[PDB]
C-alpha cells in the first residue's frame, strides 16, 4: 500500500535521511510504502537524490525534548559539520555538566548538547541492532543493557598508562578527564584521543 500518514509521519514533511556515505542530510518525505508488515519511506534530498529508506534510517528535523531521550536512544548527532548516527550513552547530569554522551556508529565518543541531536523516527526495538560494525554493536548492547552498572577506571591527569590502538599497547599519558571520557596522549605519535573510561583499551596496571 501507499500511505500518506504513518504514526506521526506525514508525506511532505521535512526530514533527515541517511545516505550511502553514512552521513545524514535534509530532505522531504515523498512516499510511505507498506510491504507486508514492513514499511519504507521515500525521501527526496534537498541537494542530490531520492532514496527508499527503512524507518531507522530517517530522523525528525527537530531537537528531541530532553525527557524523550534515554540511555540507548538512537539519534543523529553533529559529528566533530556532519550528521552521523549514534546511541545516547549518558543524559544530562551534574557530573557531565548537563550534556549528552554520544557513542557514534563508528566508535567515536563525544559530549554534545540537545541542539546537536535529532531523534531517529523508527528505531529498532533493540536500538543497537542496526549498528553495522559487529564489534561496536556488541559493545553498545553490553553497555546499554548493563546500565547503570558501568565499571570505569579512575584516571588522573599526568598518569602514565598503556592504551590499545590498532591491536597493540602504546605508552601513553592521561592529559585531561571530562566526565566519563579521558583524553589520552599517545607518546609515540604525540597525538590525543578521547576515550570512554570504561573502555578495556585503558590499562593503568601495566
Amino acid at each position: 500500500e501507499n500511505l500518506y500518514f504513518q504514526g506521526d509521519l506525514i508525506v511532505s514533511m521535512r526530514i533527515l535521511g541517511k545516505k550511502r556515505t553514512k552521513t545524514w542530510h535534509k530532505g522531504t518525505l515523498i512516499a510511505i510504502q507498506t510491504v507486508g508488515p514492513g514499511k519504507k519511506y521515500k525521501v527526496k534530498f534537498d541537494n542530490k537524490g531520492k532514496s527508499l529508506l527503512s524507518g531507522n534510517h530517517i530522523a525528525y528535523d527537530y531537537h528531541p525534548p530532553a525527557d524523550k531521550l534515554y540511555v540507548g536512544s538512537r539519534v543523529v548527532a553533529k559529528y566533530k559539520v556532519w550528521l552521523y548516527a549514534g546511541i545516547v550513552a549518558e543524559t544530562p547530569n551534574v557530573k557531565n555538566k548537563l550534556r549528552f554522551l554520544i557513542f557514534f556508529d563508528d566508535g567515536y565518543a563525544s559530549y554534545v548538547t540537545q541542539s546537536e541531536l535529532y531523534p531517529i523516527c523508527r528505531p529498532l526495538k533493540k536500538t543497537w541492532e542496526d549498528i553495522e560494525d559487529i564489534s561496536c554493536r556488541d559493545f553498545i548492547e553490553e553497555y546499554v543493557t548493563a546500565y547503570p552498572n558501568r565499571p570505569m577506571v579512575l584516571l588522573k591527569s599526568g598518569q602514565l598508562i598503556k592504551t590499545e590502538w590498532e591491536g597493540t599497547w602504546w605508552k601513553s599519558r592521561v592529559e585531561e578527564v571530562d566526565g566519563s571520557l579521558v583524553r589520552i596522549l599517545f607518546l609515540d605519535d604525540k597525538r590525543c584521543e578521547w576515550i570512554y573510561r570504561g573502555s578495556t583499551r585503558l590499562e593503568p596496571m601495566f
Binding site: 567515536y108 590499545e164 597525538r191 576515550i195
Partner: peptide, 4 residues
C-alpha cells in the same frame, strides 16, 4: 587518525 581513526577512532579506536
Amino acid at each position: 587518525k581513526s577512532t579506536x
